[PDB]
């Protein structure tokens, strides 16, 4: 699912600035 | 209508006055007892502190001057403190004290015990549309206020929104907020929230904040952002494509709003058109929103964080408690003269 793809992305935690 | 113009004109006069003559040096370190580390970053820390005289709790952001200089953050750091002491709006965190010593810069802010929107969203999964709309209305008003000061915010994301004891939002981070009457060019922000024109090396303006609002609304309502991937470059490629998919539970009104906020063509993006912010405020998805009642905080919040009193820290994570060292030698004095 899209949520599963979100989890697989590894970007589920707090996101740092570039 | 004429009331709004008059309110924003008064507000800009007060802002520019404080902007031109910032407050400095309104407390010192030994006025405070340290209680707990609330957050740790590459240039400093945020700690829960108790003012010894009054017993009031505060969040104290502590920035290591040498790390700030090492990481090329001098202007952002000075800018954030200058913004915070000069702005005044219900959904913006209040700066109570600031000072510096040999080693560090200190900003002492009202303590928001409910923690980041981010944790609550990841815990619950996603917010219902009424819940998401409640937060969204506050960001819309906040952006209307900041844009009236010619400030582009550029750093919107659930990580940067705190939930107060009334359930309302407080915006905390202003390092990237730039005074921009025209255009600006810096690549900065968080990948998931970057407008395509920031990725595309074009000049950009405050319209990037309305794009980011679209990202935020999508993430609050879906539980995940519209554009994600294993690596930032692949997020950039999805963003600049005009392609986005919606969860099947998104209402029709919500999708129509998001199609107009997540509009690649910034000459067709809501907030950036002839009627400005009123295209958003008057959109069908916001039909039930009492804008004035939101601003006056007279709307029953959909969620109230759990707070077992003042100084409760249960909505923040646990961090290794490190010393606060203050060197015998003044570090970086010339660079931070204006702080
Ligand atoms: O720790 S905060 O939640 C925080 C910040 C401001 C006021 C607060 C009032 N009550 C509670 C917490 C508060 N917080 C909001 C999210 C961002 N970080 C990350 C961070 C951590 C340490 C130093 C800098 C930064 B930074 O990205 O510039 C820290 C600040
Ligand atoms: Cl995390």
The domains found in chain B, sorted by start residue, are 1-21+116-306 (1.10.510.10), 22-115+307-339 (3.30.200.20)
Q: Which of B155, B164, B173, B279 is catalytic?
A: B155
CB distance from A4 to chain B under 8 Å? Answer: no
Find the B245 Cα to ligand 1 centroid distance in Å: 32
As beta bridge partners, residue B64 has B104
**Helix axes of B252-261 and B207-222: crossing angle, nearest 10 degrees:** 150
B325 assigned to a ligand binding site = no
CB distance from A11 to chain B under 8 Å? Answer: yes
Is B150 among the residues known to form the active site? no
Task: Measure the CA–CA gap between B50 and B59, rounded to whole angstroms.
Answer: 9
Q: In this complex, do A12 and B232 lie within 8 Å of one another by their Cβ atoms?
A: no
Task: Measure the CA–CA gap between B235 and B123, rounded to whole angstroms.
Answer: 24
Q: Which of A4, A10, A11, A16 to mutate to test the interface with B (most CBs of B within 10 A)?
A: A11
Chain B residues with at least one Cβ partner in A under 8 Å: 116, 118, 122, 155, 157, 159, 176, 187-192, 223-224, 228-230, 232, 245, 247
| Interacting residues of B231 by C-beta distance below 8 A, sequence separation 6+ | none
- Report whether A18 contacts B238 (CB < 8 A): no
Task: Measure the CA–CA gap between B205 and B104, rounded to whole angstroms.
Answer: 33
Give A-chain residues touching B224 at CB under 8 angstroms: 2-3, 6
The CA–CA distances, whole Å, from B186 to B131, B204, B206, B262, B265 equal 33, 9, 13, 20, 20
Find the B131 Cα to ligand 1 centroid distance in Å: 24
In the structure encoding, which two tokens stand for residue B80, read together? 């954030």
- Report whether B258 contacts B214 (CB < 8 A): yes
Find the A13 Cα to ligand 2 centroid distance in Å: 4
User: Could you write out the DSSP letters of every residue in B40-57?
Assistant: E-SSEEEEEEEETTT--E
The ligand minimizing its distance to the Cα of B40 is: 1
Task: Measure the CA–CA gap between B166 and B138, rounded to whole angstroms.
Answer: 13
- Long-range contacts at B55-59 (CB < 8 A, ≥ 24 apart): B57/B111, B57/B310, B57/B311, B58/B32, B58/B96, B58/B97, B58/B108, B58/B109, B58/B110, B58/B111, B59/B108, B59/B109, B59/B110, B59/B111, B59/B112
B6 assigned to a ligand binding site = no
Task: Measure the CA–CA gap between B82 and B99, rounded to whole angstroms.
Answer: 12
- Report whether B110 contacts B93 (CB < 8 A): yes
Q: Is B163 helix (H, G, I), strand (E, B) or coil?
A: strand
In the 8-state DSSP scheme, what is residue A17? P
Give B-chain residues touching A3 at CB under 8 angstroms: 223-224
Determine which residue's CA is closest to atom 17 belonging to ligand 1.
B160
> How near does any CA of chain B get to the CA of A1, in Å?
10
In the 8-state DSSP scheme, what is residue B337? T
> How near does any CA of chain B get to the CA of A4, in Å?
10
Q: In this complex, do A11 and B192 lie within 8 Å of one another by their Cβ atoms?
A: yes
As beta bridge partners, residue B44 has B63
| Interacting residues of B44 by C-beta distance below 8 A, sequence separation 6+ | B61, B62, B63, B64, B67, B68, B104, B105
CB distance from A1 to chain B under 8 Å? Answer: no
């Amino acid at each position: 699912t899209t949520y599963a793809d979100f989890i697989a992305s590894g970007r589920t935690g707090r996101r740092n600035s570039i | 209508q004429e009331s709004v113009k008059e309110f924003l004109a008064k507000a800009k006069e007060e802002f520019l006055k404080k902007w031109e003559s910032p407050s400095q040096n309104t407390a010192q370190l030994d006025h405070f007892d340290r209680i707990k580390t609330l957050g740790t970053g590459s240039f400093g820390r945020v700690m829960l502190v108790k003012h010894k005289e009054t017993g009031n709790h505060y969040a104290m952001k502590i920035l290591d001057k040498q790390k700030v200089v090492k990481l090329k953050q001098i202007e952002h750091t000075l800018n954030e403190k200058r913004i915070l002491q000069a702005v005044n709006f219900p959904f913006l965190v209040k700066l109570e004290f600031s000072f510096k010593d040999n080693s560090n810069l200190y900003m002492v802010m009202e303590y928001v015990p409910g923690g980041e929107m981010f944790s609550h969203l990841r815990r619950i999964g996603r917010f219902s549309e009424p819940h998401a709309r409640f937060y969204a209305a506050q960001i819309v008003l906040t952006f209307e206020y900041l844009h009236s000061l010619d400030l582009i915010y550029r750093d919107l994301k659930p990580e940067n929104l705190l939930i107060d004891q009334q359930g309302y939002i407080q915006v905390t981070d202003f390092g990237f907020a730039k005074r921009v009457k025209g255009r600006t060019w810096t690549l900065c922000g968080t990948p998931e929230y970057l407008a395509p024109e920031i990725i595309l090396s074009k000049g950009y303006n405050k319209a990037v904040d309305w794009w980011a609002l679209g990202v935020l609304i999508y993430e609050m309502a879906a539980g995940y952002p519209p554009f994600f991937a294993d690596q930032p470059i692949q997020i950039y490629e999805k963003i600049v494509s005009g392609k986005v998919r919606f969860p099947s539970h998104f209402s029709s009104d919500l999708k129509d709003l998001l199609r107009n906020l997540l509009q690649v063509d910034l000459t067709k993006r809501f907030g950036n058109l002839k009627n400005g912010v009123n295209d958003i405020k008057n959109h069908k998805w916001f039909a039930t929103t009492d804008w004035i009642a939101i601003y006056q905080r007279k709307v029953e919040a959909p969620f109230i964080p759990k707070f077992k009193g003042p100084g409760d820290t249960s909505n923040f994570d646990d961090y290794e408690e490190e010393e606060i060292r203050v060197s015998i030698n003044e570090k970086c004095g010339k660079e931070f003269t204006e702080f």
